[PDB]
Design a protein around this ligand. Structure first.
Ligand code: GDP
Ligand code: GDP
Lengths: 394, 394
């Protein structure tokens, strides 16, 4: 009974999961939170929040390696999957990790300094503890590599693209890809002749246009700062407005960088929370700024959904996913009502259903476009890639 | 036979026109170019490029005042129309200029420092030379004041909006408004039940969604830097990408401000010209970067057209205007072909027609949405506002 170990090294954490190869079922999940801090705890499943003090990425992984051996799982680890934040232009698909792959991930790391060096630390650690185990890298960007130049270029001088590599990359690619594959079955569509819009809505949020199985447009840019308004992120913002702010406040690009990334979005407008559960209840209680944050959020989602549809020859479906897309009855309805121009009709009883109902249609029959909720599973997609690459001879 | 004198004080020029009240026909047009420079020439109609050296806004206007008297037009000047770049939140419509109006234009001037102080210089000058003449201010922003908060707010912290006034304003409002009024007649639409998209395409370019006669969305932001890629302007650009550029090049916000405004867009990508006539011929001759600049330009126009349509309940028409929208057979077709998702069908013979054919339908009959070209006349709209306000008792 072989298993896949899925690793996601964030800026301050290591989120891991163990999945069965035969069914893709999660057998163990955990998180090594508070990395590089004096208080670094590892909490597997919730059964025991074990503690460590000031420990590196490898030490937190060596803790997992001991825990897995304690539960007799070590010999079952047939494959290891690694989440990579940025694959530049070098990666278009998931690959078996080699010395070449590591060099190439290190080459593109300047495009995402914080996240990518953490991912490499995870690879180096996992390679030490599991040398006899095949290891696979899965990139957040690789799905959007099918974007045409007209879709990924910025209006900046050509020099910045050819010399410095400034262009759209986009993210949530593993989610967008997974949700796409699932949508073709649910909606009974031919992948080779299809047009989908996938709205990934969580703390970080992005839209993606999938034409004939390929990503043709996506809302995030070179960084996760572009596109939709998000939890703490502003989304699309007038650069002239940002420069105007600088003159008045004396703030720098870096100062405003943190503001746009960490203090804006739902949190920024409402002045209350980045969490939608909080804001939805706040609006029901007549909070004005929470209502506006949600309306702004919805308006910007609808605008980008309709905009991304232009990159399609025919619109067959709109798919909601992520913590917000899976669980928010309100946001989904508000977005769909804001897209009556595309001819969407909502089935409210179907939209009322909680996430326990899984992959489900939420649009009425006379709707010109099918609307659906499909729960994303980035861990499963990483595992399915690892399983597929497990048959390869390298 | 009364006339209206229309004035547009730019950053380095004073563009003026004289229109007949009864027909709105241009009887005289001119430009006082190279303002505040050692070489400042005033060229009326082209018949005589008269010259002046290092002269202020009032001196260039005092030149016009003498020229109009030389052609015996002074006594015919019944009304004067002033183009204002920015009306903040204080102006929602065209107003008869008073001491109150001047104070209020001076209040909103920090929102557009360069252009607005030039507009005030024009008012002060024209008031001196024509005190007995009613004078009207027409704002570039006033039409977009019907935008709902969800449409004009940025995802920035609320403080920046309430305290500093950072929000979407949008521009080309006089054009968008004029073209809208004209579209209702041409398309036989009821203004009170209608949905239009107006694509203003010139050196500076913007989209506007007009729902039931009111602007509900527009592509430009607080400044003309947001939205579409333009002649020298980048348009929408990832703020994270801009901050990333700063770290590598050592450039500041101001440095990148000039780049985004003056060195980007069509000029930036192609590395050839901001002029489309140049680039279209370059592409026909197989120039690769000119082809990409045009494709990027088209892609970003289509994306914003479809996006702005979300703010409508029903899409009746898409209207092209501006130097590019009126004259470019290629861009119009490429944009419309990129919007097949909305069900647009183009009539190529009709689209082939040059601007001499004026207000014209360019879409085929079985198209779900009507497409049209309507030549914009900002001077005429300013004059029509002045004429309307000429019946008022102040
Ligand atoms: N309305 C609603 N929103 C939810 C619910 N659960 C989660 N969310 C929202 O979804 C977000 C978390 O989604 P997630 O996909 O995990 O985002 P991530 O942290 O970037 O991975 C939270 O910040 C909430 O705003 C729910 O039950 N109802
Ligand atoms: N293809 C094409 N483009 C044109 C033509 N005339 C003007 N243009 C484009 O339109 C732009 C000028 O338009 P205009 O509305 O005057 O822009 P403005 O300078 O901001 O007022 C030029 O930069 C050209 O790119 C034409 O005959 N054909």
């Amino acid at each position: 009974f072989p298993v896949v170990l899925v690793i996601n090294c964030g800026s301050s954490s290591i989120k891991f999961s163990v999945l069965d190869v035969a069914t893709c079922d999660v057998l163990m999940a955990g998180i090594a939170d508070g990395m590089n801090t004096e208080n670094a705890f590892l909490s597997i499943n919730g059964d025991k929040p074990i503690n460590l003090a000031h420990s590196n990425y490898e030490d937190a992984l060596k803790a997992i390696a001991f825990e897995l051996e304690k539960r007799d799982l070590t010999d079952s680890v047939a494959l290891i999957g690694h989440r990579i934040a940025h694959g530049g232009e070098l990666f278009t698909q998931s690959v078996i990790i080699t010395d070449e792959i590591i060099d190439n991930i290190r080459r593109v790391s300047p495009l995402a300094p914080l996240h990518n060096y953490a991912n490499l630390s995870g690879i180096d650690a996992a390679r030490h503890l599991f040398p006899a185990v095949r290891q696979v890298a899965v990139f957040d960007t690789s799905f959007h590599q099918t974007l045409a130049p007209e879709a990924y270029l910025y209006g900046l001088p050509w020099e910045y693209f050819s010399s410095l590599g400034v262009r759209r990359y986009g993210f949530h690619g593993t989610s967008h890809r997974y949700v796409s594959r699932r949508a073709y079955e649910l909606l009974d569509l031919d992948e080779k002749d299809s047009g989908l819009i996938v709205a990934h809505l969580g703390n970080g949020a992005s839209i993606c246009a999938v034409r004939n199985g390929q990503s043709v447009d996506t809302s995030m840019g070179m960084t996760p700062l572009e596109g939709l308004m998000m939890g703490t992120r502003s989304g699309d913002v007038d650069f002239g407005a940002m420069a105007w702010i600088a003159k008045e406040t004396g703030q720098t690009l870096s100062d405003l960088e943190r503001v746009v990334n960490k203090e804006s979005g739902l949190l920024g407008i409402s002045g209350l929370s980045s969490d939608l559960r909080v804001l939805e209840k706040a609006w029901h209680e007549g909070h004005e700024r929470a209502r506006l944050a949600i309306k702004t959020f919805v308006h910007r989602i609808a605008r980008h959904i309709a905009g991304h549809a232009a990159s399609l020859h025919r619109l067959d479906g709109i798919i909601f996913t992520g913590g917000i897309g899976e669980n928010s009855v309100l946001i989904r309805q508000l977005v769909i009502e804001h897209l009556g121009v595309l001819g969407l009709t909502l089935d409210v009883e179907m939209n009322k259903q909680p996430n326990s109902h899984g992959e489900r249609i939420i649009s009425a029959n006379p709707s010109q476009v099918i609307c659906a909720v499909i729960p994303t599973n980035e861990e499963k997609m990483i595992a399915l890639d690892a399983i597929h690459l497990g048959n390869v001879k390298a």
